[PDB]
Scaffold this active site. Structure first.
Site, PDB file in Angstrom:
ATOM      1  N   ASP A  36       0.789  -1.102   0.158  1.00 67.99           N
ATOM      2  CA  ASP A  36      -0.072   0.230  -0.078  1.00 67.99           C
ATOM      3  C   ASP A  36       0.564   1.118   0.410  1.00 67.99           C
ATOM      4  O   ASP A  36       1.829   1.646   0.736  1.00 67.99           O
ATOM      5  CB  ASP A  36      -1.221  -0.027   1.259  1.00 67.99           C
ATOM      6  N   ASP A 232      -2.030   5.332  -5.472  1.00 64.26           N
ATOM      7  CA  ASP A 232      -2.305   4.869  -4.446  1.00 64.26           C
ATOM      8  C   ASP A 232      -2.427   3.184  -4.273  1.00 64.26           C
ATOM      9  O   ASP A 232      -3.103   3.093  -5.580  1.00 64.26           O
ATOM     10  CB  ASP A 232      -3.734   5.547  -3.185  1.00 64.26           C
TER      11      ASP A 232
HETATM   12  C1  LIG Z   1      -7.730  -3.116  -2.262  1.00 68.45           C
HETATM   13  C2  LIG Z   1      -9.102  -3.824  -2.534  1.00 68.45           C
HETATM   14  C3  LIG Z   1     -10.435  -2.380  -2.672  1.00 68.45           C
HETATM   15  N1  LIG Z   1     -10.593  -1.174  -1.354  1.00 68.45           N
HETATM   16  C4  LIG Z   1     -10.989  -2.122  -0.304  1.00 68.45           C
HETATM   17  C5  LIG Z   1     -12.176  -3.330  -0.039  1.00 68.45           C
HETATM   18  C6  LIG Z   1     -13.127  -2.251  -0.470  1.00 68.45           C
HETATM   19  C7  LIG Z   1     -10.709  -0.317  -2.275  1.00 68.45           C
HETATM   20  O1  LIG Z   1     -10.718  -0.198  -3.708  1.00 68.45           O
HETATM   21  C8  LIG Z   1     -10.842   1.009  -1.847  1.00 68.45           C
HETATM   22  C9  LIG Z   1     -11.826   1.667  -2.121  1.00 68.45           C
HETATM   23  C10 LIG Z   1     -11.807   3.070  -0.862  1.00 68.45           C
HETATM   24  C11 LIG Z   1     -12.960   3.668  -1.610  1.00 68.45           C
HETATM   25  C12 LIG Z   1     -11.153   3.418   0.050  1.00 68.45           C
HETATM   26  C13 LIG Z   1      -9.761   2.533  -0.023  1.00 68.45           C
HETATM   27  C14 LIG Z   1      -8.857   2.661   1.032  1.00 68.45           C
HETATM   28  O2  LIG Z   1      -9.240   3.290   2.361  1.00 68.45           O
HETATM   29  N2  LIG Z   1      -7.685   2.139   1.393  1.00 68.45           N
HETATM   30  C15 LIG Z   1      -6.096   2.896   1.599  1.00 68.45           C
HETATM   31  C16 LIG Z   1      -5.874   1.271   2.722  1.00 68.45           C
HETATM   32  C17 LIG Z   1      -6.555  -0.046   2.390  1.00 68.45           C
HETATM   33  C18 LIG Z   1      -7.360  -0.069   3.400  1.00 68.45           C
HETATM   34  C19 LIG Z   1      -8.665  -1.105   3.656  1.00 68.45           C
HETATM   35  F1  LIG Z   1      -9.522  -0.478   4.781  1.00 68.45           F
HETATM   36  C20 LIG Z   1      -8.719  -2.404   3.079  1.00 68.45           C
HETATM   37  C21 LIG Z   1      -7.741  -2.408   1.941  1.00 68.45           C
HETATM   38  F2  LIG Z   1      -8.315  -3.521   1.387  1.00 68.45           F
HETATM   39  C22 LIG Z   1      -7.002  -1.102   2.192  1.00 68.45           C
HETATM   40  C23 LIG Z   1      -5.675   3.668   1.228  1.00 68.45           C
HETATM   41  O3  LIG Z   1      -4.062   3.127   1.930  1.00 68.45           O
HETATM   42  C24 LIG Z   1      -5.872   4.728   1.151  1.00 68.45           C
HETATM   43  C25 LIG Z   1      -6.273   5.056   2.279  1.00 68.45           C
HETATM   44  C26 LIG Z   1      -5.990   7.140   2.337  1.00 68.45           C
HETATM   45  O4  LIG Z   1      -5.120   7.333   3.585  1.00 68.45           O
HETATM   46  C27 LIG Z   1      -5.468   7.422   5.028  1.00 68.45           C
HETATM   47  C28 LIG Z   1      -6.001   7.649   5.398  1.00 68.45           C
HETATM   48  C29 LIG Z   1      -6.809   7.251   6.401  1.00 68.45           C
HETATM   49  C30 LIG Z   1      -5.090   6.880   7.288  1.00 68.45           C
HETATM   50  C31 LIG Z   1      -3.720   6.889   6.457  1.00 68.45           C
HETATM   51  C32 LIG Z   1      -3.794   6.639   5.221  1.00 68.45           C
HETATM   52  C33 LIG Z   1      -5.542   7.176   1.103  1.00 68.45           C
HETATM   53  N3  LIG Z   1      -5.203   5.274   0.333  1.00 68.45           N
HETATM   54  C34 LIG Z   1      -9.999   1.154  -0.670  1.00 68.45           C
END
Ligand SMILES: CCCN(CCC)C(=O)c1cc(C)cc(C(=O)N[C@@H](Cc2cc(F)cc(F)c2)[C@H](O)[C@H]2C[C@@H](Oc3ccccc3)CN2)c1
Length: 390
Positions: A36, A232
């Site tokens: 990530d 990302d």
């Molecule tokens: C990848 C598999 C599919 N998936 C997740 C399940 C639906 C997504 O496409 C998705 C969709 C959204 C609308 C947000 C995030 C998301 O928040 N991703 C974060 C990582 C992540 C979190 C999670 F719960 C499950 C995951 F599989 C992956 C990433 O860091 C994002 C979040 C933001 O940065 C931060 C926000 C808060 C704290 C720290 C970083 C920008 N980068 C991930």
């Protein structure tokens, strides 16, 4: 390619994430970890969960050190809570080094783990500024560089199959490469073009122009980066600020107007299917994102195909039809260049020189008539004004 040991070390897909194998503790405990670039915490499941078939067992590691502190990370998507500590970590198909890194042992989570993804933790490769609890918790990559001679750079080649991969197939297929400490030339074609990392927190960049089949979206470039634009791998879709999303969808609809699709499709919720092999790629437009270049008043562009922004999914009837979901959606937190976009390119995270490089991926999906591209240079003025300031 000079990093054969790390070539093809990733597995997964855009919709569930790409992961790399790592080991934690002594003796080593093998775990699959989501790559990530959108966050900065290294965390692993450390307690039973319905979607995990293995997890980090601290009591079995002789090198485990308890930091006696809780940690909570609320991502955009889901969240987890855990306990901080440190332990020895290695990457089997990576640099041949072992480092002591901070590890958040996840004890509770909500909508974080994904059923069937095959990963049990997350590797936040971004900067300390966005690490939780605060920037004093050194991210994994910073530890790796400080403790070894590994160059301060990593590169990613995420490989989308171009079609659905079932459970068995996704476990056996190569999903790409994460080259730690270098650039492997066998993973891309053409030249690498670099855009500056605007600020070191997320891997923030600046988009200066957007085209749909060569037609200028014609918005104040500041809108494209409101309130920020990041690269990302931890997000599936290309997510765009509300107003940009609305304009983009309107233009993509106009370009593909020879076929009408339901609102649910454009909302990224429902799939559309075509008889096997008949997907009308040609009616969908290519999308070009111009990024700030390293030289004053100079930009370059990356062009993606619908083979990138239309995500392959299995039909609800597991038929022989080829189906997809629209992988572009709106954001309220800035532009997010997610996995479907990265799948078209080899991306170099050159932390040492504070820049991100893009080159056409040797594994991007295309057809006989069009290919993804990375081209430059273009004369572009006042690009600094494209960046947003709160
Ligand atoms: C990848 C598999 C599919 N998936 C997740 C399940 C639906 C997504 O496409 C998705 C969709 C959204 C609308 C947000 C995030 C998301 O928040 N991703 C974060 C990582 C992540 C979190 C999670 F719960 C499950 C995951 F599989 C992956 C990433 O860091 C994002 C979040 C933001 O940065 C931060 C926000 C808060 C704290 C720290 C970083 C920008 N980068 C991930």
């Amino acid at each position: 390619g000079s990093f054969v040991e790390m070539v093809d070390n990733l597995r997964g897909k855009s919709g569930q994430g790409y992961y790399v194998e790592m080991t934690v503790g002594s003796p080593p405990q093998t775990l699959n970890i989501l790559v990530d670039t959108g966050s900065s915490n290294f965390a692993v499941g450390a307690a039973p969960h319905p979607f995990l078939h293995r997890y980090y067992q601290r009591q079995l590691s002789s090198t485990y050190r308890d930091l006696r502190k809780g940690v909570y990370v609320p991502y955009t998507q889901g969240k987890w809570e855990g306990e901080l500590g440190t332990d020895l970590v290695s990457i089997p198909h990576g640099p041949n080094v072992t480092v002591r890194a901070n590890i958040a042992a996840i004890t509770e989570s909500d909508k974080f783990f994904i059923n069937g993804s095959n990963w049990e933790g997350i590797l936040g490769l971004a900067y300390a500024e966005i690490a939780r609890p605060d920037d004093s918790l050194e991210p994994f990559f910073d530890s790796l560089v400080k403790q070894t001679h590994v160059p301060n750079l990593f590169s990613l080649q995420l490989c989308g199959a171009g079609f659905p991969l079932n459970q068995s197939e996704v476990l056996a297929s190569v999903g790409g490469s994460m080259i730690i400490g270098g650039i492997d030339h066998s993973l891309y074609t053409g030249s690498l073009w670099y855009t500056p990392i605007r600020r070191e927190w997320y891997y923030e960049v600046i988009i200066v122009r957007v085209e749909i089949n060569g037609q200028d979206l014609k918005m104040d470039c500041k809108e494209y980066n409101y309130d920020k634009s990041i690269v990302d791998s931890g997000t599936t879709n290309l997510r765009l600020p509300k107003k940009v999303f609305e304009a983009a969808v309107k233009s993509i609809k106009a370009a593909s107007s020879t076929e009408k699709f339901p609102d649910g499709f454009w909302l990224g919720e429902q799939l559309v299917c075509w008889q096997a092999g008949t997907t009308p790629w040609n009616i969908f437009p290519v999308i070009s994102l111009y990024l700030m270049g390293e030289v004053t008043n100079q930009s370059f562009r990356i062009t993606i195909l619908p083979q990138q922004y239309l995500r392959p999914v299995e039909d609800v009837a597991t038929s022989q039809d080829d189906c997809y979901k629209f992988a572009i959606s709106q954001s309220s937190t800035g532009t997010v260049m997610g996995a479907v976009i990265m799948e078209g390119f080899y991306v170099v995270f050159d932390r040492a020189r504070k820049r991100i490089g893009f080159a056409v991926s040797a594994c991007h999906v295309h057809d006989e008539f069009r290919t993804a591209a990375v081209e430059g240079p273009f004369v572009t003025l006042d690009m600094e004004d494209c960046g947003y300031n709160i």
